[PDB]
Amino acid sequence: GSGSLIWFRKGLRVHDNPALEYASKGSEFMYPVFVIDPHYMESDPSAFSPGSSRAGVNRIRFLLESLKDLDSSLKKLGSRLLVFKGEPGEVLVRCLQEWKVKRLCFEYDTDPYYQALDVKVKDYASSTGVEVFSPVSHTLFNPAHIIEKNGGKPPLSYQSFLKVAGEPSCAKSELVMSYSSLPPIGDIGNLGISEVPSLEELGYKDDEQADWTPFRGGESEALKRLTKSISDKAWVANFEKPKGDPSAFLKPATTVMSPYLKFGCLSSRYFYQCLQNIYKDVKKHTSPPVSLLGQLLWREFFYTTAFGTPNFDKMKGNRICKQIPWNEDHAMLAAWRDGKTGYPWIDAIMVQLLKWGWMHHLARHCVACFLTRGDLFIHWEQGRDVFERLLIDSDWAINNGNWMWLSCSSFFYQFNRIYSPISFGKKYDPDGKYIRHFLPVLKDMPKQYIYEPWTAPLSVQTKANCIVGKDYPKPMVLHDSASKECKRKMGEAYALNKKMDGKVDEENLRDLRRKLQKDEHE
Ligand SMILES: Cc1cc2nc3c(=O)[nH]c(=O)nc-3n(C[C@H](O)[C@H](O)[C@H](O)COP(=O)(O)OP(=O)(O)OC[C@H]3O[C@@H](n4cnc5c(N)ncnc54)[C@H](O)[C@@H]3O)c2cc1C
């Protein structure tokens, strides 16, 4: 008889799943599918840290966990999760041509990877008589609608986006959070049926599995943590993003729902709905941009902008990105990536990236600034790539948008507002608790130098059992001069961008790069 297939990619959850719902109705049997793409999941010995070439082992373990939770939640309703390994496009059509499937459902998505897959699968299904339901539930708004309504392009600013965006449909909507039951799986036919694969099966040695980010994945954890994240009504009511403490690691200054919203473990519509409820239950609460709900709106802003901008994930070809002659220097990038820059604050943060796969927004700010238009002047696409595989909440739209923001390549252009690798952390942690924790090599350094070990008298060092240049590196660069040179180049780069009416050529750029080379080398 007529069967259905619920294809899972990002909505790794049972609650608020418009796609899963439809797949359960009018079907005597249902096929829940998820494909492990070797290219993204399997071990890559060439990578700079355990994982594939696109994902650190941390985000991978998170996904695998989300998958187990999901299957489990399905095995509860009498269903199950069928996991195949291979190129999704191939796997999917081979599933269609193998099963009596008349209806194919999967949550919509705007990432390039998925836009590409969905054209193929859609065309195959359409040409083979399979119905296709691809509802928008990963975001509160439909990028295409916003862009269409706004004329022909995406609103140029948060403020402008909210005006146009209006309010999400899920507002007065009633979401489906549970199901009494779910259609039985149905003939598995002849396909390599598989259970969620272990890190080992993905090719990872045990030493590559020693560390553990402190955040389990899955819808279960998701919902549980949301409950904890917003239990304090006053806190959520008085929420102001800029006022959070970036050094607070024992108790993160924000929700950390980031990874669950990225893999769809948590519906953002439900979250948005909860916030709404507790907002009306008080009377006085913060509003965007700084509000907690205002944060779900930043996600919306970048997604819409990302979906409407070709070459969004790169400078060249990007309508909205300022053309800047960034340097390239695997040695400098490496020093920053592994957290060996010399500035304890920056290094401590980069280590939290590697160990937690998450850092407070402001921390992400500092290291992104230091790496680009703040001190090193390395291409933002480079910090972007490092972040993309290390963050357990790595999100295409969000990550690219933010790196362009922190590099003053787009959205924000007050490049003379530079974070200080030395003094910023003090504003919150003068004792340097955060640093000591993630950089135990400086465990004993006296607070008078914790943010600048290179200024600690040689005697203090040896006693603190930390010698700059041996145990802990010395400043890879001197902030003052560095940031002053960045502010300089940044100036002439903007000058060129303005002179060429936002259309700098491959030529001009090259000539600027040369020009700056002279004025800053001889
Ligand atoms: C250079 C740089 C790279 C970044 N890369 C990513 C990334 O790959 N994935 C990612 O999810 N966030 C990224 N961010 C944005 C932000 O830091 C995170 O969303 C936030 O730290 C997540 O913590 P939280 O869940 O406690 O956020 P909360 O403050 O508790 O907000 C709740 C939710 O709102 C969303 N949100 C919060 N801030 C932003 C923001 N500035 N832009 C868009 N959405 C936001 C997130 O989905 C988050 O889970 C990046 C920021 C910078 C400066």
Swiss-Prot record:
Q: Which residues bind FAD?
A: 241, 254-258, 295-299, 358-361, 364, 393-395, 399
Q: Which Pfam families match?
A: DNA_photolyase, FAD_binding_7
Gene Ontology molecular-function annotations = DNA (6-4) photolyase activity; DNA binding; nucleotide binding
The EC code for this enzyme is 4.1.99.13
Cofactors: FAD
- Which keywords does the record carry? DNA damage, DNA repair, DNA-binding, FAD, Flavoprotein, Lyase, Nucleotide-binding
- Catalytically driven reaction(s): (6-4) photoproduct (in DNA) = 2 pyrimidine residues (in DNA)
Top-level taxonomic group: Eukaryota
Please give the residue ranges the record annotates as the region Interaction with DNA: 360-365
Picking any one GO biological process from the record gives:
pyrimidine dimer repair
Name the PROSITE patterns on file.
PHR_CRY_ALPHA_BETA
The answer, when asked if rRNA-binding is one of the entry's keywords, is: no
Q: How is the cofactor bound?
A: Binds 1 FAD per subunit.
Residues that bind DNA, according to the entry?
Answer: 298, 405
| Biased composition annotated in UniProt, kind: Basic and acidic residues | 517-522
EC main group? lyase
Q: According to its UniProt entry, what is the function of this protein?
A: Involved in repair of UV radiation-induced DNA damage. Catalyzes the photoreactivation of pyrimidine [6-4] pyrimidone photoproduct (6-4 products). Binds specifically to DNA containing 6-4 products and repairs these lesions in a visible light-dependent manner. Not required for repair of cyclobutane pyrimidine dimer (CPD).
Q: Write out the similarity annotation.
A: Belongs to the DNA photolyase class-1 family.
The protein depicted here goes by the name (6-4)DNA photolyase
Q: Which gene encodes it?
A: UVR3
